Every structure is written in structure tokens, then in C-alpha cells.
Ligand binder design. Structure first.
Ligand code: FR6
Ligand code: ZN
Length: 349
């Protein structure tokens, strides 16, 4: 069944949206949280979309499982660990993965997320739990993993502590910053906390990626390039509505963070339009394929490569070119990059 079995690189996956069902019920009960169901195959069914939803509906999936993992140290540890393994199962030689460390904390975080009242688990050891899990996940599974931390659009307060965590846990294993949540909250790229965050990020050399152009306009994209100085773009579907911005982004090789299965299920793609990805194979730009949320979209990378495969005419020669593109645009230092490059050419030959 695989649409492409060569190795692949993936650059945009959300950790807290690639937890396993089996594991969430394990924790919801062993903590007394417990949740809408008890057999794995039916819980996956209530957390999981098959059909576009609204923002509250969507947001609410997160509401069911998250309280079962945030707070618990070995819930954190086990989720990063078990993430790597899913990506090993998946043909991936290199993954980058993101989360918000605040959204898994229960100490030193106003406000406390998901209704938890307090523990002692801060943002600081959530990273480091996560990255411990990712390191012995890497080592046991032979997948090279790095991590991105995400600022949240609605919460600029948290942003200086993001840039700061990035600097601290640099290398081991964090290599970039993100902006996530809903890009639709007016003026959000321009909130002073977010922008001083991204500026500290160019001051100290932290890589940058912003979610932009999924559901919001070409001006959130524009905001992200000219102001937040992104190096890459989550989705960016809406830069296509501005053809000088599109044309200039082709000219300077934007890397675009594509997630095509994810985008039917969200709404960002109306099925009766060009999928933005296809204009993307036709115009030969710099882009990847990406799963975004396995747990919620009931998917794996193969669902994305299948979907493109048979609905959109792509071939194995574009599937390679996109993976290499991915590797080039990854946030690896250039020595490790040329080595990831090498393995990929060899494999493709
Ligand atoms: C970044 C994280 O990894 C979470 C954030 C979940 C969440 C929590 C609180 C407020 C939010 C507001 C908007 C969207 C998601 C939000 N997350 C998981 N997947 C996505 C996505 N598909 O874009 C966002
Ligand atoms: Zn995303």
C-alpha cells in the first residue's frame, strides 16, 4: 500500500495531536480524569474528525484528551517517546515536531490550561521531559528528531518565555520557534509580545516558522515575512490570493508547510477548488508534505501521500524532489544537513 516507500522528511507535526488512543486512556484512568469512552477504537472515533468543523468543535477535541496528559511527567515523557516510534513506522528519516510547553504544564502558567488546578509541572521541565522522550525515542528507533516550540496567538505573554526556552534547550533538541493557534484573531502577528519574541529569535539565532495563510489572509502571510521574519511557512495557502506576494515568495524560495489531508478536514480547502499544493507542483516551488495532526485527522503520512497520489496526479519524481526540498529547508545545522542530503540521494538512486 505505501504511496512512496523511500525515506521521507516531515517538518510540521503537532506533538499533542499525535498521541496514541491506547496511551490516552491509559492515563485518563490511571489519573482519574477519565474520559468519553474506554475502548481505543471508539475513543479515536470521538476525538477524530472526518468532516470539516467549526473552531469551537475543533478546539473541543483537545478538551477531551489533553487533561489526561498535561501535568503528568511520564505522560509527557511517554508521548514524545511514542511519537518517535510512530514516525519510524511511517517511513520518516527526519522529523521536526512542535508543541506548546505551556499547554502541557500545570505550574507557572497563567491561565492554567484545560481546567486543571495546580500542580508542580512547569513549562520548563515539560521541554526536557519531551526532549528526553525524543532522545531515547531517536536512539531506540533510528529516526532523527528535532523540536519546535510554539507560541500561541491568543497568548503573547507566553512568548518571551518561548524564545527563552529555545535558547536554553537549543540543539538538545530544540531548533526553532513557531506561532500557532488561530491566525484570525485580529492584529495577532503584530502583538508586541510575539514580535519581540521573533526579534530575540533573530538576535540569538533561533530558527523561525510561522503558521500563516491556512484560514487567514495574504496579510497574515505578509506579516510573517516582513515583520516576524520567518524562514518558513505553515500552510500558506492564502499567499496564492496575492500574486506579487506569491511571486516574490517563489523568487526567494519560501519553504511552504503543506498539509493536504489536514486541509480538507479543516475547511481551509474547499474541494471544488484547486488544491493549493497542485499549483505548487506546477510552479516548482519549495514545499513539503506533512501530516499535521494524526490523532485528530485519523491519519498518517501515507494518507497524505495517497491523497495526493491519486487525487492530484503526483508522481514519484515529485515525491522525491519534495523530500529533498524538505531536507534542504530543515532547521538542521549545515553540516548535519549535507549528511541528511547524502542519505536521501543514495536512497533515491
Ligand atoms: C500548538 C499546539 O501544538 C496545539 C494547540 C491547541 C489549542 C489550544 C488552545 C488554543 C488554541 C487556539 C487555536 C487553535 C488551537 C489551540 N495544536 C494542535 N494542533 C493544532 C493545529 N491543527 O493547528 C494546534
Ligand atoms: Zn499545524
Amino acid at each position: 500500500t505505501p504511496a512512496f516507500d523511500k525515506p521521507k522528511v516531515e517538518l510540521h507535526v503537532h506533538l499533542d495531536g499525535a498521541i496514541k488512543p491506547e496511551t490516552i486512556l491509559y492515563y485518563g484512568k490511571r489519573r482519574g480524569i477519565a474520559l468519553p469512552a474506554d475502548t481505543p477504537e471508539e475513543l479515536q472515533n470521538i476525538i477524530g474528525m472526518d468532516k470539516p468543523l467549526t473552531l469551537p468543535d475543533f478546539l473541543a477535541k483537545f478538551d477531551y484528551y489533553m487533561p489526561a496528559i498535561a501535568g503528568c511527567r511520564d505522560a509527557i515523557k511517554r508521548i514524545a517517546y511514542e511519537f518517535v516510534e510512530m514516525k519510524a513506522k511511517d517511513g520518516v528519516v527526519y522529523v521536526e515536531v512542535r508543541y506548546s510547553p505551556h499547554l502541557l504544564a500545570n505550574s507557572k502558567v497563567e491561565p492554567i490550561p484545560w481546567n486543571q488546578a495546580e500542580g508542580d509541572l512547569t513549562p520548563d521541565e515539560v521541554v526536557s521531559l519531551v526532549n528526553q522522550g525524543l532522545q531515547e525515542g531517536e536512539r531506540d528507533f533510528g529516526v532523527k528528531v528535532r523540536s519546535i516550540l510554539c507560541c500561541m496567538r491568543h497568548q503573547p505573554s507566553w512568548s518571551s518565555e518561548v524564545v527563552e526556552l529555545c535558547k536554553k534547550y537549543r540543539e538538545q533538541t530544540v531548533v526553532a520557534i513557531d506561532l500557532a493557534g488561530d491566525e484570525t484573531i485580529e492584529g495577532s502577528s503584530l502583538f508586541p509580545g510575539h514580535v519581540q519574541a521573533y526579534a530575540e529569535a533573530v538576535k540569538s539565532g533561533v530558527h523561525r516558522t510561522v503558521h500563516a495563510g491556512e484560514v487567514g489572509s495574504a496579510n497574515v502571510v505578509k506579516e510573517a515575512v516582513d515583520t516576524l521574519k520567518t524562514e518558513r511557512l505553515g500552510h500558506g495557502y492564502h499567499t496564492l490570493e496575492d500574486t506579487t506576494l506569491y511571486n516574490r515568495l517563489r523568487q526567494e524560495n519560501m519553504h511552504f508547510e503543506i498539509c493536504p489531508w489536514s486541509s480538507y478536514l479543516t475547511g481551509a480547502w474547499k474541494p471544488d477548488t484547486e488544491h493549493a499544493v497542485i499549483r505548487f507542483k506546477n510552479d516548482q516551488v519549495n514545499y513539503s508534505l506533512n501530516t499535521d495532526d494524526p490523532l485528530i485527522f485519523k491519519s498518517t503520512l501515507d494518507t497524505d501521500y495517497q491523497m495526493t497520489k491519486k487525487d492530484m496526479g503526483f508522481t514519484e519524481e515529485e515525491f522525491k524532489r519534495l523530500n529533498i526540498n524538505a531536507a534542504k529547508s530543515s532547521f538542521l545545522p549545515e553540516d548535519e544537513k549535507k549528511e541528511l542530503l547524502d542519505l536521501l540521494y543514495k536512497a533515491y538512486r
